[PDB]
Amino acid sequence: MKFATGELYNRMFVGLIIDDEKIMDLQKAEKKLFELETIPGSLIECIAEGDKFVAHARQLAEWAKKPNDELGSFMYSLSEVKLHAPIPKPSKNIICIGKNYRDHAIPEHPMVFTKSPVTVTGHGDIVKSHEEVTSQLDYEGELAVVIGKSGTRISKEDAYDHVFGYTIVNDITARDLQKRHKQFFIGKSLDTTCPMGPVLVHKSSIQEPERLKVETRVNGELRQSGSASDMIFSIPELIETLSKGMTLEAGDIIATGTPSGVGKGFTPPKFLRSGDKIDITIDPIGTLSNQIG
């Protein structure tokens, strides 16, 4: 159950990855197979429909396995399709956790800040180097959770009820602008500094998110490697705290923090330069790859 926002011949569509060489255009698939048009035009709208959207999508996928002559019109090879961020335009800033792995800091309450929606970009998209502004761009591979069901004062016990699914984020950061403005917003909210994707995997496919593992490579070289079980604050705890006096809405994105291995962490620090390739891998979400322009 891997959802995505794809683009093909100047149409943007909500897709479902089938086997990982094919993407189904859900609106067009619904139209041929069920002669219905109910599936909305964006993944955030779909997320708001909840479990029934996903059930509908499961059924479309199984009906697409049964033979018919018009596959080419709603089933496309991934090679031919540009993947945008699963949610190209969040309705609010991405909620980011700071220092949530033990050796990254090297915290009794979560440190929480945000990235502007203007940061959001997709798999394969160029990240601006922003050579005026900063010479301390840094990578941060993270597990992102997407809220699927609005709520406030959500307890830990039912936190996963409010989760839709998981994606990858690269929380790219200007380290000098962080220090300069004290609060992290400006250094966290440069244009194109939030690669997201390549897909949004529904939680029904990830029964054990504690066993999720994030891995970051820079120009092929492994930099980060952490496990979600090592998080200081678990996903349920973050949801409990975040929602204590605030409403979490369908489509809200929480970046749950980066492990150690960031560029600032090294003596000589390793900041990003033009041409650098960043690949972040979390199975079974896949790999989020971006290049510095």
Which spans of this chain sit near a second copy (rule: CB under 8 A)? 89, 91-93, 95, 98, 109-114, 116-118, 128, 130, 132-134, 152, 174, 180-186, 189-191, 241-242, 244-247, 249
User: Is residue 209 reached through a cis peptide bond, with omega within 30 degrees of 0 on the bond before it?
Assistant: no
Closer Cβ to a second copy, 193 or 289, answer by number: 193
Draw the binding track, 163-202, toward Mn ion (x: CB under 5 A; -: no contact): --------x-------------------------------
Segment holding 239, helix H or strand E = helix 235-242
User: Is residue 117 reached through a cis peptide bond, with omega within 30 degrees of 0 on the bond before it?
Assistant: no
Alpha-carbon distances of 120 from 46, 139, 196, 206, 289, rounded to whole Å: 19, 14, 7, 24, 14
Closer Cβ to a second copy, 30 or 252, answer by number: 252
Residue type, 78: L
Draw the binding track, 238-267, toward Mn ion (x: CB under 5 A; -: no contact): --------------------x---------
Closer Cβ to Mn ion, 14 or 96, answer by number: 96
- Strands (DSSP E) along 139-260, which ranges? 141-147, 163-170, 173-174, 194-202, 213-218, 221-227, 253-255
130 binds, among a second copy, Mn ion, none (CB under 5 to 8 A by kind): a second copy
H helix runs in 13-170, sequence order:
26-33, 43-49, 51-63, 102-105
260 binds, among Mn ion, a second copy, none (CB under 5 to 8 A by kind): none
Token code pair at residue 11: 């149409």
Number of residues that bind Mn ion (CB under 5 A): 4
Least Cβ distance, residue 182 to a second copy (angstroms): 5
132 binds, among Mn ion, a second copy, none (CB under 5 to 8 A by kind): a second copy
Which single residue is written with the structure tokens 């939680």?
203
Draw the binding track, 89-108, toward Mn ion (x: CB under 5 A; -: no contact): -------x------------
140 binds, among Mn ion, a second copy, none (CB under 5 to 8 A by kind): Mn ion
Residue type, 270: K
Within 116-145, the residues that bind Mn ion by CB under 5 A are: 140
Rg for the chain (alpha carbons), in Å? Answer: 19
12 binds, among Mn ion, a second copy, none (CB under 5 to 8 A by kind): none
The residues near 34 (Cβ < 8 Å, ≥ 6 apart) are 60, 63
Draw the binding track, 4-23, toward Mn ion (x: CB under 5 A; -: no contact): --------------------
Least Cβ distance, residue 87 to a second copy (angstroms): 13
Burial bucket for residue 38 (CB in 10 Å: 0-12, 13-18, 19+): exposed
Segment holding 17, helix H or strand E = strand 11-17
Least Cβ distance, residue 231 to Mn ion (angstroms): 12
Q: Which residues bind Mn ion (CB under 5 A)?
A: 96, 140, 171, 258
